[PDB]
Design a protein around this ligand. Structure first.
Ligand SMILES: [Zn+2]
Lengths: 75, 299
């Protein structure tokens, strides 16, 4: 299918994914065009922070969905 | 003296103590917790969370009172968030751990969802044929706003409008144009929550390939009108009032969280809370802080 990621600048990029893909696979694809390592990424959907290990099927992420990308600020 | 209890820092735990001071300053959230936990009188995260917030939402009962909140971290460490008890963490990530745990706890139904829960719209029209793909509604628990770039004075209203502005999206499959082609995409706000958490993204990505702390001051007001960012043309006014501010000092790797919040009535008096230390603070100091998380409540 095809999903959207709201990036750090507010620009929204397009990704090609499958419902069987894990989000570490998706974080890998965000790295491809944004250059953010997966360990530095936080993906939020429907108010949920997406857990590396699950697939897009467990979160029921369907076509034309918008994921939001934010970094981790330690303190 | 109208001072709340402080919270001990048992090992870079300011990220939790700052969030708890902010959350306890949101009366609508505490009223919802009391309503939600009232069913248990007919373990759980909500009971542990309410015990701390109820105590922090009132003036201290003893002089220079200091509490410990790590019972809360213990239960999250056990079931929801596998983290150390000594490493620095992000107060916004914790907010989403708490908010996800409460939605999971509610799912297991005459009671309402928690007041932070809102819904956003996503509209998209192909620029080629001009047909408007069906609207998509997603829920949100907070607004994560990118901070724009000589920007003169920088305002929260500017950050909000940028979050709501339209953009050009290339290479998406138009169903009419059957195809790819280029779309115009825009996010609006459908259902506003009673409790509004605003996250100002103070980490960006540099041209080199390394994170950058955003130190720039973003002007924010005690009063916030959210009408300009609504999807639907309904007649209901949407006015919000500032309850608390979480502030992050330091760089990307290292840092410290601090919280400005209102004094509890047993109002217009403010407090600076840094872990175990509580001071009276003026509204001028609050409005000059470098906000990271903003807690608004609908009036
Ligand atoms: Zn078209």
């Amino acid at each position: 299918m095809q999903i959207f990621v709201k990036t750090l600048t507010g620009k929204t990029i397009t990704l090609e994914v499958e419902p069987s893909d894990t989000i570490e696979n998706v974080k890998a694809k965000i790295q491809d065009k944004e250059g953010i390592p997966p360990d530095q990424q936080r993906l939020i959907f429907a108010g949920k922070q997406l857990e590396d290990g699950r697939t897009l099927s467990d979160y029921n992420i369907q076509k034309e969905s918008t994921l939001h990308l934010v970094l981790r600020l330690r303190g | 003296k109208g001072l709340v209890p402080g919270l001990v820092n048992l090992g870079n735990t300011c990220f939790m103590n700052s969030l708890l001071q902010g959350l306890s300053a949101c009366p609508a959230f505490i009223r919802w917790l009391e309503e939600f936990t009232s069913q248990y009188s007919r373990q759980y995260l909500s009971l542990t969370l309410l015990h701390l917030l109820k105590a922090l939402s009132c003036q201290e009962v003893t002089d220079d009172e200091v509490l410990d909140a790590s019972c809360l971290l213990d239960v999250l460490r056990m079931y929801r968030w596998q983290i150390s008890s000594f490493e620095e963490q992000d107060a916004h990530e914790l907010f989403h751990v708490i908010t996800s745990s409460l939605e999971d706890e509610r799912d297991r139904h005459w009671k309402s969802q928690h007041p932070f829960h809102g819904r956003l719209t996503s509209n998209m029209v192909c620029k080629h044929c001009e047909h408007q793909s069906p609207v998509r509604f997603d829920t949100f628990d907070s607004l994560s706003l990118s901070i724009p770039a000589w920007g003169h004075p920088l305002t929260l209203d500017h950050c909000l409008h940028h979050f709501i502005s339209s953009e050009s999206v290339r290479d998406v499959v138009c169903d009419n144009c059957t195809k790819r082609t280029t779309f115009v995409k825009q996010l609006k706000l459908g259902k506003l929550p009673q409790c509004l958490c605003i996250h100002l993204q103070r980490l960006s990505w540099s041209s080199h390939g390394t994170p950058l702390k955003r130190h720039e001051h973003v002007q924010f007001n005690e009063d916030l009108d959210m009408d300009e960012y609504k999807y639907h043309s309904n007649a209901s006014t949407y006015l919000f009032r500032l309850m608390a501010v979480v502030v992050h000092h330091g760089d990307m790797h290292s840092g410290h969280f601090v919280t400005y919040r209102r004094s509890p009535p047993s109002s217009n008096q403010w407090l600076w809370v840094s872990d175990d230390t509580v001071r009276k603070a003026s509204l001028q100091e609050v409005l000059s802080s470098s906000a990271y998380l903003l807690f608004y409540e609908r009036v």
